[PDB]
Design an enzyme around this catalytic site. Structure first.
Site, PDB file in Angstrom:
ATOM      1  N   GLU A 143       0.976  -1.119   0.218  1.00  0.00           N
ATOM      2  CA  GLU A 143       0.117   0.073   0.077  1.00  0.00           C
ATOM      3  C   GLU A 143       1.072   1.252  -0.041  1.00  0.00           C
ATOM      4  O   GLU A 143       0.511   2.428  -0.643  1.00  0.00           O
ATOM      5  CB  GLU A 143      -1.129  -0.200   1.139  1.00  0.00           C
ATOM      6  CG  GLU A 143      -2.222  -1.234   1.079  1.00  0.00           C
ATOM      7  CD  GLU A 143      -2.674  -0.855  -0.362  1.00  0.00           C
ATOM      8  OE1 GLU A 143      -2.997   0.135  -0.444  1.00  0.00           O
ATOM      9  OE2 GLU A 143      -2.258  -2.065  -0.435  1.00  0.00           O
ATOM     10  N   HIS A 168     -17.143 -12.204  -9.874  1.00  0.00           N
ATOM     11  CA  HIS A 168     -16.530 -11.174 -10.797  1.00  0.00           C
ATOM     12  C   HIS A 168     -16.771 -11.537 -11.972  1.00  0.00           C
ATOM     13  O   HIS A 168     -16.989 -10.682 -13.009  1.00  0.00           O
ATOM     14  CB  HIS A 168     -14.644 -11.824 -10.717  1.00  0.00           C
ATOM     15  CG  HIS A 168     -14.562 -11.144  -9.232  1.00  0.00           C
ATOM     16  ND1 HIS A 168     -14.704 -12.193  -8.449  1.00  0.00           N
ATOM     17  CD2 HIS A 168     -13.449 -10.434  -9.073  1.00  0.00           C
ATOM     18  CE1 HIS A 168     -13.473 -11.455  -7.049  1.00  0.00           C
ATOM     19  NE2 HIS A 168     -13.639 -10.282  -7.601  1.00  0.00           N
TER      20      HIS A 168
HETATM   21 ZN    ZN Z   1      -0.670  -1.503  -5.278  1.00  0.00          ZN
END
Ligand code: ZN
Ligand SMILES: *[C@@H]1O[C@H](CO)[C@@H](O[C@@H]2O[C@H](CO)[C@@H](O)[C@H](O)[C@H]2NC(C)=O)[C@H](O)[C@H]1NC(C)=O
Ligand code: NAG
Ligand code: NAG
Ligand code: NAG
Ligand code: NAG
Ligand code: NAG
Ligand code: NAG
Lengths: 240, 244, 199, 199, 48
Positions: free
Chosen positions: D58, D188
Site C-alpha cells: 500500500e 467477478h
Molecule cells: Zn498497490
C-alpha cells in the site's frame, strides 16, 4: 460645479513700489554679530510691483510663475484663501493645490479639472475644481493665517517647493508700508512638479477690503546683517 | 500584509507607498513567510537605499504557481493574468494561506483567466469578461462551438495538498525616477557623549571635536552655527533640542 | 489557420478543469463512504457518480467531431482516443435498455447465492460458512456435498442471461467498428504510429 | 532508491486502524489517488507478516501515483493494467528477504537460514502466485476460443469439462447438462472483470 | 566550443556569499555554509 460670474467692472489695476520687503533666511545657519554676503534669488529693492483689489470689483488673473514670486497681503477678515500652481491647470497635467478652508489646510498634487473662475462661497462653498484622477501627496497642518499683513515667497527648485512667511500688524489703507522684516522658512515639499502659472482664491461677501501684490525674484547679491541674537535686522542690495 | 482578503488572480490590487520610512528588517527576519526572493538587490542592506515610489501587488495563486511568478518564467497564469518584465527592481514574497483561504466544500470566490489571445504586457491588469473565440466562425456574442469562457473559479478545501493549497503573494517593486526620493530605511542613532574628543555625525554633519553645553540661543528653525571663519562651532541635537 | 487541435486543446483544458474538481469531491465523498456507510452517504455517491458519468458522456460526444487524424502527437492522440469512447449507446434504445435491465438482474439476485445442507440443523452461506467448508477441511464428504449443493442451484437461473450478454457485447463491439468481442478486448495492447516499438 | 515518504496528509488524515466509534468500514487495504495533492490511505492493518507485506504494498503501490503525479490529469495513470499492480508486489519482495529483516532488527544478528527453510518460501509463493499461471493462461485460452467462436455454441459449458480431461488434467465428479453454469459461481464474472490482468 | 557542451557544463562554480570584501590577490577556498541571520546554520541549509 462653478458659477460663471461677470458682474465686475473692468478697471486698470494700479502699481506700487516694493521699497524694502522681500528678505528671507537663505540657509539653516545661525550667525551672530556678523555681516554676511550671499548670492541667491531675491526681490530687488524699490521694485516695480502690481496691485490687485477685492471688494463690486474683483479679479483673479492667471499670473505667471517664472522664477519665484513674492506674495503679500495687508487685507483683513481672511478673504485670501489659497493658491493653485501648475503648468496647464487642467486634468492632463499635475497641479499643486493649497487652500485654507474653515477647519484645516489641504495640500494636494492632483490633475484637478479647474474651473475658469475658482471661487469659495457663515458658510463656505468649495467651487474650484471638478475631478481628481489620483493624488500623489497630501498634507495637513496649522493654517498660515489694525489690519494683518501676510508675506510669502514661493520658490521651486530641484524638485523642491519652499515656502517662507511672516505676519505683522498693519494699519491704514496704505500699500506696502516701509520697514524691514525677514521671512522665516515654513514648509518644504519634495513634489517635483513644473510650475509656470499661479492663481489666488477669495470668497464672495454674500453668495472687508482685500488687496494683494505680486513681485518677482531675480538672481542678485545681498549683504545681510546679523545681530547677536541671530536675527536679520538689515540688508543691502549690491547692485542698486 | 496583515490583510483579511486578497485580490483575484486576474485583477491584482496595486498600492503605492511613498513619503514614509520603510522598516524592511521585519520582513526578511520573519520566518513565517515561505518565499522571499529579491531581484536586483539583497535582503540585507536594503534599508540603506532610497527610492521615490513603491508598488505592492497582491493576489492568491497555487503552490506550484509561485515559481511561475518571476522575470522570464512562462506559463498560463504568468502569461495571461500577471506578467513580470525581464528587468526587476524589487522582491517577491509569498507564504502559505491554508488556514485562511481554504474552506470546506470549496472556496470558489477566486477567479482567473486561463486562455488569452496573447501574453499580457508587463505590469498590466486584465479585467475583461468577454466570450473568447478560438474558431474562424463567429458565434455572435453567445457561447457556442469554439467559443468558450476564459474565466473559471478556484476550489480551495482544507484537505488539498501543499502543492495545490492557497498561497498569498505580495510583489514589492521599488521604482526610481527623476524626482526626490521619498522612501528610505530607518536611521540608526547611538547615544551621545560629552566632554570627550569623539567623532560625531549630526544629521549628516560629520566632524571631530569635544561637545559641551552651550549658552547660545538658536532660532527655532536653525540647526547649526558658524563663526566668522565659516567653521562649524555649534550644533543642535536632532533628538534633544539643545545647543552644543 | 485555426487548426482543430488549437480548439481541442482549449476543450481539453476545460475538461481537465471540470473533471479535477468533479473527481476530487467525488473521491472526497468516496472516502467518506468507505469510512462511514449510512443512508445519506450512499445517496450522494450515487448522485456524484451519475453526474460524473453524464459529464464524461457529454465530453465523449464533444470529442466526436474532432477527429483523431488531426493530431500527430501520439501522446495527445492517446487522450482523445480514451475520451472519444462512448460505450453501449451506439445501438438502438431498446437494446441498450435491455442491457441496463439485464445488468441490474445480475446485480441483485446473483449476490444472494445460497446452499442447502443435508442436515437442517446447520445452515452456512458462502461468506464465511461455505468458504471454511471448501478450503479449511480435511475430509471428502463435506467438500462433495458443498460442491453438489452449490452448483446444483445457481446454474439453472443464471445460464440463459450469459448468451444474451455475450451477443449484445458483440453487437456493441461491431458498433465501434471492431471485428468481435475479442478484438474489443484485444485493443488494449495495440500500438500504431510509434514505429518499431509496437505490438 | 530515492523514493520519499507519504505526504503529511497521510499522517493525520489517514487512519492506520479500524475506528471503534461504532462505524463499520471496509477492512480491505485500498489504494486511493484523490488528486489535487490530497492522498488518503485505509486498511485495518495488524502486526502480522502478511499485513507487514501489504503495508509495503500500500505504501509502495501508491508511490507509483506520486511518480506520474506531474503528468497531465488524463495521463496520471500507469503504463497499462499490469504495470501498476506489478510495481507494488515487487516492493514487498525485497522486504521479505532475510538480509533485510536481519538488518532491520526483525532477525537476530547471528541468524542463519537453512536450505530446507528456504524450501517453504518457494512453495508458499508459488502456491500463492505462480501455481495458477497455467490455470489462468488456459482459462483465458478457453475464454478466447469462446470469444473467437472456436467452441460451438451448443457445447459452451461441456467443453470446459471435455478438454478438462486431457488438457486441464482435472476430472469432473458428476457430469452436468447444458443448463448449468460453472462460471456463475464467481461474483467477478457477472461484473465483466478481465482475467489477463493477473497474468 | 570546448567548455560548453550540449549535455551541460556545470563543473564551474563561483563564490557569492562571501560576507566580506577581497584584498588584492586573495584566495578563498572555504566552502562552509554561509549564515545570513542570527540563527546558526549548524551545517544545514535553511532560512538565512
Ligand atoms: Zn498497490
Ligand atoms: C522621540 O521619541 C521619544 C519616544 O518617547 C520621545 O520621548 C522622549 O524621551 C526622552 C528620553 O528617552 C525624554 O527625556 C523626553 O521627555 C521624551 N519626550 C516625550 C515627549 O515623552 C522624544 O520626545 C521624541 N523626540 C522628539 C524631538 O520629539
Ligand atoms: C512701476 O510702478 C509705478 C507706479 O505707478 C509706475 O511707474 C508704473 O506703473 C510701473 N512701471 C512700469 C509698468 O514700467
Ligand atoms: C474643510 O476641510 C475639511 C477637510 O480638511 C472638511 O472635513 C470640512 O468639512 C471642510 N469644511 C468646509 C466648510 O468646507
Ligand atoms: C463659463 O464657464 C465655462 C467653464 O470653462 C466656460 O464655457 C467659460 O469659461 C464660461 N463662459 C463664458 C464666460 O461665456
Ligand atoms: C493618475 O492620473 C493620470 C492622469 O493625469 C494617469 O496618467 C495616471 O496613470 C494615474 N495614476 C494612477 C495610479 O491611477
Ligand atoms: C519639466 O520641465 C523640464 C524642463 O524645464 C522638462 O525637462 C521636464 O520634462 C518637464 N516635466 C514635466 C512633467 O512637464
Ligand atoms: C535677545 O534675546 C533675549 C532673549 O529673548 C532678549 O532678552 C533680548 O532683549 C534680545 N536682545 C535683542 C537686542 O534683540
Amino acid at each position: 460645479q462653478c458659477v460663471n460670474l461677470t458682474t465686475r467692472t473692468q478697471l486698470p489695476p494700479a502699481y506700487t513700489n516694493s521699497f524694502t520687503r522681500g528678505v528671507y533666511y537663505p540657509d539653516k545657519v545661525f550667525r551672530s554679530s556678523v555681516l554676511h554676503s550671499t548670492q541667491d534669488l531675491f526681490l530687488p529693492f524699490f521694485s516695480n510691483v502690481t496691485w490687485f483689489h477685492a471688494i463690486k470689483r474683483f479679479d483673479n488673473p492667471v499670473l505667471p510663475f517664472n522664477d519665484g514670486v513674492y506674495f503679500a497681503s495687508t487685507e483683513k477678515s481672511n478673504i485670501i484663501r489659497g493658491w493653485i500652481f501648475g503648468t496647464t491647470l487642467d486634468s492632463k497635467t499635475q497641479s499643486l493645490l493649497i487652500v485654507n478652508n474653515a477647519t484645516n489646510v489641504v495640500i494636494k498634487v492632483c490633475e484637478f479639472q479647474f474651473c475658469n473662475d475658482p471661487f469659495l462661497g457663515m458658510e463656505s462653498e468649495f467651487r474650484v475644481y471638478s475631478s481628481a484622477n489620483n493624488c500623489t501627496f497630501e498634507y495637513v497642518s496649522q493654517p498660515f493665517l489694525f489690519k494683518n499683513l501676510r508675506e510669502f515667497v514661493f520658490k521651486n527648485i530641484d524638485g523642491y517647493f519652499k515656502i517662507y512667511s511672516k505676519h505683522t500688524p498693519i494699519n491704514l489703507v496704505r500699500d506696502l508700508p516701509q520697514g524691514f522684516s525677514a521671512l522665516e522658512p515654513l514648509v518644504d515639499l519634495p513634489i517635483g512638479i513644473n510650475i509656470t502659472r499661479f492663481q489666488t482664491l477669495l470668497a464672495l461677501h454674500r453668495s472687508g477690503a482685500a488687496a494683494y501684490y505680486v513681485g518677482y525674484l531675480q538672481p542678485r547679491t545681498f549683504l545681510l546683517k546679523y545681530n547677536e541674537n541671530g536675527t536679520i535686522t538689515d540688508a543691502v542690495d549690491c547692485a542698486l | 500584509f496583515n490583510a483579511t482578503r486578497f485580490a483575484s488572480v486576474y485583477a491584482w490590487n496595486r498600492k503605492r507607498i511613498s513619503n514614509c520610512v520603510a522598516d524592511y528588517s521585519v520582513l526578511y527576519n520573519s520566518a513565517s513567510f515561505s518565499t522571499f526572493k529579491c531581484y536586483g538587490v539583497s535582503p540585507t542592506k536594503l534599508n540603506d537605499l532610497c527610492f521615490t515610489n513603491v508598488y505592492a501587488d497582491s493576489f492568491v495563486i497555487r503552490g506550484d504557481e509561485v515559481r511561475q511568478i518571476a522575470p522570464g518564467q512562462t506559463g498560463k497564469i504568468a502569461d495571461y493574468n500577471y506578467k513580470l518584465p525581464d528587468d526587476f527592481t524589487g522582491c517577491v514574497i509569498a507564504w502559505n494561506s491554508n488556514n485562511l483561504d481554504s474552506k470546506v466544500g470549496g472556496n470558489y470566490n477566486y477567479l482567473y483567466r486561463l486562455f488569452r489571445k496573447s501574453n499580457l504586457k508587463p505590469f498590466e491588469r486584465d479585467i475583461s469578461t468577454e466570450i473568447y473565440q478560438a474558431g474562424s466562425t463567429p458565434c455572435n456574442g453567445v457561447e457556442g462551438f469554439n467559443c468558450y469562457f476564459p474565466l473559471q473559479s478556484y476550489g480551495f478545501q482544507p484537505t488539498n495538498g501543499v502543492g495545490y493549497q492557497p498561497y498569498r503573494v505580495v510583489v514589492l517593486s521599488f521604482e526610481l525616477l527623476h524626482a526626490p526620493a521619498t522612501v528610505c530605511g530607518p536611521k540608526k542613532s547611538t547615544n551621545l557623549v560629552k566632554n570627550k574628543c569623539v567623532n560625531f555625525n549630526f544629521n549628516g554633519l560629520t566632524g571631530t571635536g569635544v561637545l559641551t553645553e552651550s549658552n547660545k540661543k538658536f532660532l527655532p528653525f536653525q540647526q547649526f552655527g558658524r563663526d566668522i571663519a565659516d567653521t562649524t562651532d555649534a550644533v543642535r541635537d536632532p533628538q534633544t533640542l539643545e545647543i552644543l | 489557420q485555426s487548426t482543430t487541435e488549437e480548439q481541442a486543446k482549449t476543450f481539453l483544458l476545460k475538461f481537465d478543469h471540470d473533471a479535477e474538481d468533479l473527481s476530487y469531491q467525488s473521491s472526497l465523498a468516496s472516502w467518506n463512504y468507505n469510512t462511514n456507510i449510512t443512508d445519506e452517504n450512499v445517496q450522494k455517491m450515487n448522485e456524484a457518480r451519475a453526474k460524473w458519468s453524464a459529464f464524461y458522456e457529454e465530453q465523449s460526444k464533444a470529442a466526436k467531431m474532432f477527429s483523431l487524424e488531426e493530431i500527430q502527437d501520439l501522446t495527445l492522440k492517446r487522450q482523445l482516443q480514451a475520451l472519444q469512447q462512448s460505450g453501449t449507446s451506439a445501438l438502438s434504445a431498446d437494446k441498450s435498455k435491455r442491457l441496463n435491465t439485464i445488468l441490474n438482474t445480475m446485480s441483485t439476485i446473483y449476490s444472494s447465492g445460497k446452499v442447502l445442507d443435508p442436515n437442517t440443523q446447520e445452515c452456512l452461506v458462502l461468506e464465511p460458512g461455505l468458504d471454511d467448508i471448501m478450503e479449511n477441511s480435511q475430509d471428502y464428504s463435506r467438500r462433495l456435498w458443498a460442491w453438489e449443493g452449490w452448483r446444483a442451484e445457481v446454474g439453472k437461473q443464471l445460464r440463459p442471461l450469459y448468451e444474451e450478454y455475450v451477443v449484445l457485447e458483440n453487437e456493441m463491439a461491431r458498433a465501434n467498428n471492431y471485428e468481435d468481442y475479442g478484438d474489443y478486448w484485444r485493443g488494449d495492447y495495440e500500438v500504431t504510429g510509434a514505429g518499431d516499438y509496437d505490438y | 532508491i530515492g523514493l520519499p515518504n507519504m505526504t503529511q496528509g497521510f499522517w493525520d488524515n489517514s487512519m492506520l486502524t479500524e475506528p471503534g466509534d461504532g462505524r463499520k468500514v471496509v477492512c480491505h487495504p485500498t489504494a486511493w489517488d484523490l488528486g489535487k495533492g490530497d492522498f488518503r490511505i485505509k486498511m485495518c492493518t495488524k502486526v502480522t507478516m502478511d499485513d507487514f507485506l501489504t503495508a509495503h504494498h500500500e505504501m509502495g503501490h501508491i508511490q507509483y501515483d506520486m511518480a506520474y503525479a506531474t503528468q497531465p490529469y488524463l495521463l496520471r495513470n500507469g503504463a497499462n493494467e499490469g504495470f501498476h499492480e506489478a510495481v507494488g508486489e515487487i516492493m514487498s519482495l525485497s522486504a521479505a528477504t532475510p538480509h533485510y529483516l536481519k538488518a532491520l532488527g526483525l532477525l537476530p544478528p547471528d541468524f542463519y537460514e537453512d536450505s530446507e527453510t528456504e524450501i517453504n518460501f518457494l512453495l508458499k509463493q508459488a502456491l500463492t502466485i505462480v501455481g495458477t499461471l497455467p490455470f489462468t493462461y488456459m482459462l483465458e485460452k478457453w475464454r478466447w476460443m469462446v470469444f473467437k467462436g472456436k467452441i460451438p455454441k451448443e457445447q459452451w459449458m461441456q467443453k470446459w469439462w471435455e478438454m478438462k480431461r486431457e488438457i486441464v488434467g482435472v476430472v469432473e465428479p458428476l457430469p452436468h447438462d447444458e443448463t448449468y453454469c460453472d462460471p456463475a459461481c464467481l461474483f467477478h464474472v457477472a461484473e465483466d472483470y478481465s482475467f489477463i490482468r493477473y497474468y
